[PDB]
Design a protein around this ligand. Structure first.
Ligand code: CLA
Ligand code: CLA
Ligand code: CLA
Ligand SMILES: CCCCCCCCCCCCCCCCCC(=O)OC[C@H](CO[C@@H]1O[C@H](CO)[C@H](O)[C@H](O)[C@H]1O)OC(=O)CCCCCCCCCCCCCCCCC
Ligand SMILES: CCCCCCCCCCCCCCCCCC(=O)OC[C@H](CO[C@@H]1O[C@H](CO)[C@H](O)[C@H](O)[C@H]1O)OC(=O)CCCCCCCCCCCCCCCCC
Ligand SMILES: CCCCCCCCCCCCCCCCCC(=O)OC[C@H](CO[C@@H]1O[C@H](CO)[C@H](O)[C@H](O)[C@H]1O)OC(=O)CCCCCCCCCCCCCCCCC
Ligand SMILES: CCCCCCCCCCCCCCCCCC(=O)OC[C@H](CO[C@@H]1O[C@H](CO)[C@H](O)[C@H](O)[C@H]1O)OC(=O)CCCCCCCCCCCCCCCCC
Ligand SMILES: CCCCCCCCCCCCCCCCCC(=O)OC[C@H](CO[C@@H]1O[C@H](CO)[C@H](O)[C@H](O)[C@H]1O)OC(=O)CCCCCCCCCCCCCCCCC
Ligand SMILES: CCCCCCCCCCCCCCCC(=O)OC[C@H](COP(=O)(O)OC[C@@H](O)CO)OC(=O)CCCCCCCCCCCCCCC
Ligand SMILES: CC1=C(/C=C/C(C)=C/C=C/C(C)=C/C=C/C=C(C)/C=C/C=C(C)/C=C/C2=C(C)CCCC2(C)C)C(C)(C)CCC1
Ligand SMILES: CC1=C(/C=C/C(C)=C/C=C/C(C)=C/C=C/C=C(C)/C=C/C=C(C)/C=C/C2=C(C)CCCC2(C)C)C(C)(C)CCC1
Ligand SMILES: CC1=C(/C=C/C(C)=C/C=C/C(C)=C/C=C/C=C(C)/C=C/C=C(C)/C=C/C2=C(C)CCCC2(C)C)C(C)(C)CCC1
Ligand SMILES: [Fe+2]
Lengths: 505, 80, 342, 99, 30, 59, 107, 37, 38, 38, 67
């Protein structure tokens, strides 16, 4: 009998049951989408979108729903923290219900197509045998894909008919769903330009329509037909697997490095925004601008938004998690509730000291305090028998500007050490570790989870492409080689390898 | 059998072969020796001579910090 | 054969001492360039300006300590072309900036692609099945995940392996200290696959060589064989009975035996590749939270896992200063973790 | 370019995809095959016998030309009457239908 | 001049090889 | 415990730089290489004795 | 199936080496042959199925066939004058090389 | 019989492309051994 | 002109002696000069 | 305008095309010079 | 045993009627190769733009281009 790994090959030469199994797969995928949306809606807390955003609660499909212009729910709330005004049919719950209904309809269609498999549409008129004309089917499907791409990019993204896409400022503080106009110059290839998205979809749709018409009109060459085995469907499978793993690599890279299609306000900051001082440089620039305007240090530090401070956190860094640390970051660090303030460390003589921030690589980092010239001035020693930079010797104190602890100065060495330990992670915040019983270990974001999963899928699908291409090219020897295969494999028997018409030398 | 080339055992035991190759191999060996000894190896590939590891300007290890000014930075670091 | 394609295919797929084929045009130039780049980098090019070391025979290194070093971390993930906006056409300064590493890696990947294509082409010319070409996917995946995907998910090419012996040893020790790579289940599967493949090779060789048939009168049994013969040269029944009475289970199918031989190392290498892909984003199975919490609450609880954690901490703290010059880590001697009297 | 030249094709036999057979070879050439074009049938989705035919090309050319004549005259007349460019007229009518 | 010395060293090698192999090479060419 | 043994052994004897450890690593890597090579070569030359709905092991 | 005479092993002077290369040994086919340790022979010879398959593996894929060797190459065409020219050239080149090595170094 | 073989073939180029640089590099490395720091 | 060939065992002996001498030179140079720790 | 990096990119593309053309021309030349007469 | 007749199947029947019809010879392979070469050049250009191996005046290639 058939081995357990060859069961699904019964529908290789059955177009009706191939359609049936594809319909079943589509039904399962739609059902998963609807159920996941409902489950995420049942556990989402939209009370605070500033310090408890979407990405801190481990939401996967909700940012993907929000990216295309869905922000309201039947529950009366809005993803921006406002009040819903006539949510309409297309809310989160509406979309989930639509996906569920679609899955049911696809299930019914799959049943119908499995039962009725002997349609005469699938027969070859010349021989009355089941067959498919793959080049023309590819032409039809390419035409439809180009039409859909053009329609999306022209009506949805541009706002002519659809809502638009999510656009935000570079620091992810003020971001809403807007309508973006196409960009046709060289700036349309900037990965941080939504006009590039609109222009790409329009142009690619037009080219797809033109190529679909070409493939509908022109027959494949005989040499290419024989070489690529266009009468087989496994060649289509291999080529499609190659295309999808290429796309998986591209989307994984785009999500990891960040682009205009992956907003940080929806997915989370990237590791390069932390290891390059993006938000820290912005905060320092804003503070210096306020200070130059004849304002005190506390006044300058009190106008920094809590969102900008929260973005400057190695806990929010996506490259600080673990493979088996399940759940949201709220399950590992606690729900943030307030910004303590900017901790300023001063020497006994008044000189400022700065804590060396902990790099992304290190799980644990030593605590050292540097001055403005980068020289070490204080640290928390490991060997306390002899010390030269001890905090007790130097006499370091910490003062907070802005935030919850504005104007409070700590001089106790234990408290100074404790606050210098938290300055490594960036901006000191207040967390609620009792609501969810948080462990105390950092976790990763949907950005990291997406990148990991799709890289693994891309590698496995590379193997799948190799296997299926080898199987479709080497199809006649799938059961074994010929009984007598010795004359063709004799060294120096023919001038050409495997050619029996060149017997010499 | 044979793919249509002279056997290696036939070639390697030939007076002609060992007369031609009594010049080429030593010539290449001497060419490599002269390439190293004349200082060409240091200049072509930019390796530091034992006296050029540390200059009077800097007594620490070199460090390149700029990606687009990397050419000028490595030109400055290599100054003797 | 009259067309251009036909005559070119006639010449390329000729019976020769060295088979060229259509894939030779991609394999031979890239492989030659990669080998030459490695040899040139290990013999003449240094690593003083990009890493702060010496990595050439010209500077006084042997075969073990010579390597082609990765670019500096400032260059990020730049492809570092000879004509790029960093080297700007200067060959000596391109070599000094670390452009030979990217040269070697980018040519080696295409050489691997060409070699699998050559395997496919030769298999099709001889009219056999492409299982040898399928088996090369495991080495190709290992190379792709270790040398490309892992650095592409990090700060730059600086954290990629360097083409050398001691450089690879440093890479391994870094992976232990920072990632706790030994505690990764995917690496455990890879180790199991490699060791099982070695076991299978040794046991199959010994079993075949010790169940031979008497086809001659001489003590030298290598001369009692002919490749075109029909009968098998060893006793499968005797081998099966021996291993059934010694071990408990034994093979009774030669085809299944040899497919298992093919299957084990490929699966092991693929699992290790998946593990390294996961590790590229610092998604490391580093710790057990229950054990950490118990050891924190109870100062008497100790296992080997905690000792390994302390060893990793020491490795990180003492290697960080020199392994990563860009971070400019200055560590006073009293902050480095240390034991008693050691 | 000879787009109306009577095209010649080839017929490739069906690939053997039987799972119950030991050898499943690819499809060979059945024979040369030159179709006859410019024949209309009751298909409603492909009435003509072949795409590359002189009569079908003539019909396409005539339809294209009639549409182009109407388009040119209409663009000129609308631009003269309304004063808006024929490109901006589409957006203007979309925002507020008018004539 | 340093490369010129190596080229001048390599010239007689090519001369000798051509002197020893020209005959059979021409025979093979025809 | 095995991992701890390996790490302490490296810290005290520098096993990675030992030629005998290099020979052992070459042994295991070559064993895997040759096992895969032999298995693939034997699996690629099977004589046809079955159909496409059953495995060659039944052949 | 295999003709031993057509395997290109007929141009070997040493009879024992010639027999070794074809995978043949006249001594071992005798029923009274005894090897060094003292074990009798069954008359198989080097290979049991030598008659069925023509020859052994040694007689199937030899790696030393003097018959296929080129007729030329066993005699130097350039003769004694060529050897004298070669000797002069090698002496001159050795002198030039040692002079260049000494001069370019630090004595 | 008489056997005549070509002098220059694909095998010739394949052998020499790996043999010539090997000897050049070996000479360079041998020269490298006598350099004093 | 000059009939005769060169013994293959002689060729092998000379090649082996040459490679052994090269390796010995490499080891000696490892014990003195550059990269000799003194 | 066009930056020097763009000029280098275009030159690299042209050089790759030249390398491909040279390889193809050499292969065609040797294939035509030495053919198989069936 | 022709099959199962259906109005939609009869409507879509001409779209699945020419199974093995091919253009003799190499056909339009050279044109497709030209398009493939253009696609490869375009992919190289955009990859170098993202990789910062090519620098353009108006292309910021940073998060600041969202301003
Ligand atoms: C890793 C090696 C690898 C191997 C051995 C194969 C092997 C195979 N491929 Mg797959 N493939 C691969 C990777 C690989 N592929 C990649 C990365 C893609 C892109 C998604 C594809 C996409 C693909 C398609 C679309 C098809 C196949 C098919 C095939 C089959 C034969 C046809 C073939 O030779 O295509 C040629 C494959 C190549 C990789 C060689 C081309 C070499 C490139 C062009 C190098 C040029 C260098 C570059 C431009 C330099 C500058 C770049 C720099 C800026 C970075 C065979 C199973 C064909 C088939 O028969 O399927 C049933 C087919 O339809 N493959
Ligand atoms: C055999 C194939 C081959 C392949 C696939 C590669 C592949 C690669 N090489 Mg190597 N190389 C080769 C042979 C090859 N090389 C040879 C023979 C040499 C001479 C020694 C070199 C020398 C070399 C150098 C010096 C460098 C590389 C590097 C690289 C990269 C080049 C990046 C680039 O932008 O390409 C160009 C882009 C392409 C997409 C070209 C394809 C364009 C198609 C053909 C269109 C043609 C259209 C055009 C407009 C018209 C031209 C035709 C007309 C002029 C006749 C890539 C990984 C770089 C490196 O590794 O950096 C780290 C680099 O620095 N290579
Ligand atoms: C794009 C979709 C795709 C499709 C439609 C196919 C289709 C097919 N494959 Mg290919 N394949 C793919 C991708 C795909 N493959 C990939 C990515 C790989 C690499 C892992 C392979 C590797 C592969 C092998 C090694 C083999 C096939 C074979 C087959 C055939 C039978 C499969 C079988 O019966 O399994 C039946 C499967 C089972 C009874 C249970 C498998 C359960 C797995 C282990 C995990 C559970 C999966 C989970 C529920 C869903 C996955 C989530 C999703 C993200 C992937 C069939 C033509 C077989 C063959 O060629 O036949 C002649 C075969 O031997 N395929
Ligand atoms: C069947 C295949 C469908 C494939 C996807 C089609 C688009 C799906 C999203 C649309 C959607 O949900 O709209 C949803 C909207 C719903 O409109 C309103 O939405 C509000 C939301 O707050 C309201 O609350 C209500 O839900 C509703 O009244 O639909 C419409 O406005 C009607 C659109 C009718 C379109 C019919 C044809 C669609 C496909 C046309 C071809 C592609 C585009 C043109 C390409 C060629 C151009 C030359
Ligand atoms: C630059 C863009 C190049 C585009 C090339 C498209 C693929 C062309 C395939 C032709 C081979 C084929 O299918 O033969 C089909 C025919 C069968 O009929 O194949 C044969 O007769 C034997 C094929 C043996 C292997 C051929 C590999 C061809 C590789 C071509 C690489 C590019 C060459 C560019 C010049
Ligand atoms: C048939 C077998 C069915 C079961 C299979 C085994 C499943 C094992 C893993 C289960 C999750 C971890 C344990 C658990 O319960 O955690 C518990 C967690 C969640 O459970 C709780 O959830 C709460 C919110 O509702 C909080 O977040 C809590 O902190 C959290 O613990 O479960 C998960 O996170 C499930 C994730 C499932 C999807 C995995 C995403 C990654 C996919 C990678 C794909 C590629 C893989 C490599 C290549 C091959
Ligand atoms: C492993 C498989 C083979 C991999 C390639 C090996 C050859 C690479 C080049 C080596 C080289 O030239 O070294 C050249 C170096 C040069 O030697 C160095 O020269 C320097 C000059 O400034 C210093 O004097 C150094 O002290 C001196 O060691 O020699 C060595 O490292 C000595 C080892 C000799 C060769 C060992 C080959 C590898 C080990 C054996 C493998 C096969 C075992 C059977
Ligand atoms: C299977 C077979 C595979 C065969 C491979 C054959 C050779 C492939 C040739 C291409 C390889 C080189 C790709 C370079 C990509 C690169 O530089 O990325 C790095 C650059 C981004 O650059 C980074 O940007 C960051 C932004 O905050 C920082 O500024 C970093 O410093 C900067 O390096 O991305 C690109 O160039 C394109 C990204 C999108 C495409 C992804 C390609 C694959 C990525 C793998 C997954 C990564 C996680
Ligand atoms: C006194 C005895 C001393 C030694 C005792 C040894 C005991 C171990 C024997 C294990 C047999 C299990 C085989 C299962 C599968 C089985 O039934 O094997 C039987 C299988 C039969 O082969 P056939 O040729 O009959 O198969 C025909 C094909 O058609 C199959 O599709 O033979 C093998 O594959 C041998 C390889 C065994 C490799 C086993 C290695 C050890 C496994 C890992 C152990 C983990 C322990 C965990 C503890 C917590
Ligand atoms: C009948 C009907 C209906 C209904 C329907 C329904 C109700 C449906 C549902 C559906 C559903 C509700 C579905 C679902 C699905 C799901 C799925 C399909 C899932 C899957 C999963 C998976 C596959 C996973 C995996 C994994 C794991 C396990 C772990 C980790 C890793 C991974 C991820 C791999 C209605 C009335 C409407 C209409 C009419 C008809
Ligand atoms: C870079 C580059 C390039 C290329 C180049 C080339 C391609 C080169 C080559 C090179 C080469 C190609 C080299 C080689 C070398 C070799 C060597 C150096 C060897 C050595 C050896 C040894 C040392 C040995 C040893 C031994 C003994 C004696 C005993 C036994 C064992 C053994 C075998 C290990 C070009 C210009 C294109 C472009 C730009 C860049
Ligand atoms: C052929 C061949 C080979 C070889 C090689 C070699 C390298 C060899 C060598 C050899 C040799 C190299 C030998 C030697 C020997 C020697 C001897 C045997 C000596 C002795 C001596 C004596 C006994 C002494 C004595 C004395 C005394 C004590 C006192 C005073 C006086 C006198 C000095 C007399 C090979 C492996 C490649 C391969 C195969 C073939
Ligand atoms: Fe075996």
């Amino acid at each position: 009998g058939l081995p357990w790994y060859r069961v699904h090959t019964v529908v290789l030469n059955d177009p009706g049951r191939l359609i049936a199994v594809h319909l079943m797969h589509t039904s399962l995928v739609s059902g998963w989408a609807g159920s996941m949306a409902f489950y995420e809606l049942a556990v989402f807390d939209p009370s605070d979108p500033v310090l408890n955003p979407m990405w801190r609660q481990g939401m996967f499909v909700l940012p993907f729903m929000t990216r295309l212009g869905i922000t309201q729910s039947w529950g009366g709330w809005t993803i921006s923290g406002e009040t819903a005004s006539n949510p309409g049919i297309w809310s989160y719950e509406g979309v989930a219900a639509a996906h569920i209904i679609l899955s049911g309809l696809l299930f019914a269609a799959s049943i119908w197509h499995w039962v009725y498999w002997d349609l005469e549409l699938f027969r070859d008129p010349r021989t009355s045998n089941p067959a498919l004309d793959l080049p023309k089917i590819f032409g039809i499907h390419l035409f439809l894909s180009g039409l859909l791409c053009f329609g999306f990019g022209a009506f949805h993204v541009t706002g002519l008919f659809g809502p638009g896409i999510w656009v935000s400022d570079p620091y992810g503080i003020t971001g809403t769903v807007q309508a973006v106009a196409p960009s046709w110059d060289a700036t349309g290839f900037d990965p941080y330009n939504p006009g590039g998205i609109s222009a790409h979809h329009i142009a690619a749709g037009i080219l797809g329509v033109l190529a679909g018409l070409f493939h509908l009109c022109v027959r494949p060459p005989q040499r290419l037909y024989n070489g690529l085995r266009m009468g087989n469907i496994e060649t289509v499978l291999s080529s499609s697997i190659a295309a999808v793993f290429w796309a998986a690599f591209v989307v994984s890279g785009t999500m990891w490095y960040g682009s205009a299609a992956t907003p940080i306000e929806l997915f989370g900051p990237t590791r390069y925004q932390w290891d390059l001082g993006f938000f820290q440089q912005e905060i320092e620039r804003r503070v210096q601008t306020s200070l130059a305007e004849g304002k005190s240090a506390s006044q300058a530090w009190a106008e920094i938004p809590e969102k900008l401070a929260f973005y400057d956190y190695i806990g929010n860094n996506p490259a600080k998690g673990g493979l088996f640390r399940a759940g949201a970051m709220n399950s590992g660090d606690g729900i943030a509730v307030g910004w303590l303030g900017h901790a300023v460390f001063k020497d006994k003589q008044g000189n400022e000291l700065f804590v060396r921030r902990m790099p992304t690589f290190f799980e644990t980092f030593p605590v050292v305090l540097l001055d403005k010239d980068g020289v070490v001035r204080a640290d928390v020693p490991f060997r306390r028998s002899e010390s030269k930079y001890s905090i007790e010797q130097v006499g370091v104190s910490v003062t907070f500007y802005g935030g919850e602890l504005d104007g409070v100065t700590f001089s106790d060495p234990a408290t100074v050490k404790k606050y210098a330990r938290r300055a490594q992670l960036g901006e000191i915040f207040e967390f609620d570790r009792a609501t969810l019983q948080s462990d105390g270990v950092f976790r990763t974001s949907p950005r990291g989870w997406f990148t990991f999963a799709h890289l693994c899928f891309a590698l496995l699908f590379f193997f799948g492409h190799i296997w299926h291409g080898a199987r479709t090219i080497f199809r006649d020897v799938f059961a074994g080689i010929d009984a007598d295969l010795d004359e063709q494999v004799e060294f120096g028997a023919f001038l050409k390898l495997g050619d029996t018409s060149t017997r010499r030398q | 059998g044979a793919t249509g080339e002279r056997p290696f055992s036939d070639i390697l035991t030939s007076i002609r072969y060992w007369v031609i190759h009594s010049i080429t191999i030593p010539s290449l060996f001497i060419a490599g020796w002269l390439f190293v000894s004349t200082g060409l190896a240091y200049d072509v590939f930019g390796s530091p001579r034992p006296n050029e590891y540390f200059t009077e300007d800097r007594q620490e290890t070199p460090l390149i910090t700029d990606r687009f000014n990397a050419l000028e930075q490595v030109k400055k670091l290599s100054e003797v | 054969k009259r067309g251009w394609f036909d005559v070119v295919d006639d010449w390329l797929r000729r019976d020769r001492f060295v088979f060229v084929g259509w894939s030779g045009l991609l394999l031979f130039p890239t492989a030659y360039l990669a080998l030459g780049g490695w040899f040139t980098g290990t013999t003449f090019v240094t690593s003083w300006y990009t890493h702060g070391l010496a990595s050439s025979y010209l500077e006084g290194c042997n075969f073990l300590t010579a390597a082609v070093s990765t670019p500096a971390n400032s260059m990020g993930h730049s492809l570092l072309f000879l004509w790029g906006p960093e080297a700007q056409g200067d060959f000596t300064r391109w070599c000094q900036l670390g452009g030979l590493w990217t040269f070697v890696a980018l040519h080696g990947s295409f050489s691997l692609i060409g070699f699998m294509l050559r395997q496919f082409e030769i298999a099709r010319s001889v009219k056999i099945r492409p299982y040898n070409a399928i088996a090369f996917s495991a080495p190709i995946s290992v190379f792709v995940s270790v040398f490309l995907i892992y650095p592409l998910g990090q700060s730059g090419w600086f954290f990629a392996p360097s083409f050398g012996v001691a450089a690879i040893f440093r890479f391994i020790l870094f992976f232990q200290g920072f990632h706790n790579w030994t505690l990764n289940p995917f690496h455990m599967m890879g180790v199991a696959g490699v060791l099982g493949a070695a076991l299978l090779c040794a046991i199959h060789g010994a079993t075949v060589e010790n169940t031979l048939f008497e086809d001659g009168d001489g003590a030298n049994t290598f001369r009692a064989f002919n490749p075109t013969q029909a009968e098998e040269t060893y006793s499968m029944v005797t081998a099966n009975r021996f291993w059934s009475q010694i071990f408990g289970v034994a093979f009774s199918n030669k085809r299944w035996l040899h497919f298992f031989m093919l299957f084990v190392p490929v699966t092991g290498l693929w699992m290790s590749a998946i593990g390294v892909v996961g590790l590229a984003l610092n998604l490391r199975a580093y710790d057990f939270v229950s054990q950490e919490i118990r050891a924190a609450e109870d100062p008497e609880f100790e296992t080997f896992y905690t000792k390994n954690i302390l060893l990793n901490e020491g490795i990180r703290a003492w290697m960080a200063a020199q392994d990563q010059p860009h971070e400019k880590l200055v560590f006073p001697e009293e902050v480095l973790p240390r034991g008693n009297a050691l | 370019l000879g787009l109306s030249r009577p095209a010649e094709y080839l017929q490739i036999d069906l690939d053997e995809l039987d799972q119950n057979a030991a050898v499943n070879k690819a499809g060979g050439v059945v024979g040369a095959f030159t179709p006859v074009a410019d024949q209309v049938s009751t298909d409603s989705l492909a009435p003509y016998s072949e795409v590359f035919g002189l009569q079908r090309f003539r019909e396409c050319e005539l339809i294209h030309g009639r549409w182009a004549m109407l388009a040119c005259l209409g663009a000129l007349v609308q631009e003269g009457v309304t004063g808006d460019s024929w490109v901006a007229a589409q957006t203007l009518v979309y925002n507020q239908p008018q004539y | 001049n340093r490369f010129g010395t190596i080229a001048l060293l390599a010239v007689p090698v090519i001369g000798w090889v051509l002197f020893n192999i020209l005959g059979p090479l021409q025979n093979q060419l025809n | 415990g095995t991992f701890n043994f390996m790490i302490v052994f490296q810290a005290e004897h520098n096993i990675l730089m030992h030629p005998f450890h290099m020979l052992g690593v070459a042994g295991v890597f070559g064993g895997s290489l040759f096992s895969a090579m032999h298995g693939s070569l034997v699996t690629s030359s099977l004589i046809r004795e079955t159909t496409e709905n059953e495995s060659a092991n039944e052949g | 199936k295999i003709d031993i005479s057509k395997q290109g092993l007929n141009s070997i002077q040493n009879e024992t080496v010639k027999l070794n290369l074809m995978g043949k040994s006249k001594t071992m086919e005798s029923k009274d042959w005894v090897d060094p340790q003292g074990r009798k022979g069954k008359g198989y010879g080097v290979y049991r199925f030598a008659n069925k398959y023509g020859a052994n593996v040694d007689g199937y894929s030899p790696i030393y066939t003097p018959d296929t060797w080129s007729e030329s190459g066993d005699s130097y065409k350039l003769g004694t004058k060529g050897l004298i020219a070669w000797a002069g050239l090698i002496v001159v080149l050795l002198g030039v090389g040692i002079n260049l090595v000494i001069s370019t170094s630090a004595l | 019989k008489s056997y005549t073989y070509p002098i220059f073939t694909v095998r010739w180029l394949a052998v020499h492309a790996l043999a010539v640089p090997t000897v050049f590099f070996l000479g360079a490395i041998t020269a490298m051994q006598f350099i004093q720091r | 002109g000059t009939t005769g060939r060169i013994p293959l065992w002689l060729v092998g002996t000379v090649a082996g002696v040459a490679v052994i001498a090269l390796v010995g030179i490499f080891f000696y140079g490892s014990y003195v000069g550059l990269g000799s720790s003194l | 305008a066009a930056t020097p990096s763009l000029n280098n990119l275009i030159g690299s593309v042209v050089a790759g095309g030249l390398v491909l053309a040279a390889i193809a021309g050499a292969i065609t030349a040797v294939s035509n010079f030495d053919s198989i007469r069936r | 045993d022709t099959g199962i007749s259906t109005p939609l199947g009869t409507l879509l029947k001409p779209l699945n009627s020419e199974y093995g019809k091919v253009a003799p010879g190499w056909g339009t392979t050279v044109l497709m190769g030209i398009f493939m070469a253009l696609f490869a050049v375009f992919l190289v250009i955009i990859l170098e733009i993202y990789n910062s191996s090519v620098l353009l005046d108006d292309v910021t290639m940073s998060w600041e281009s969202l301003a």
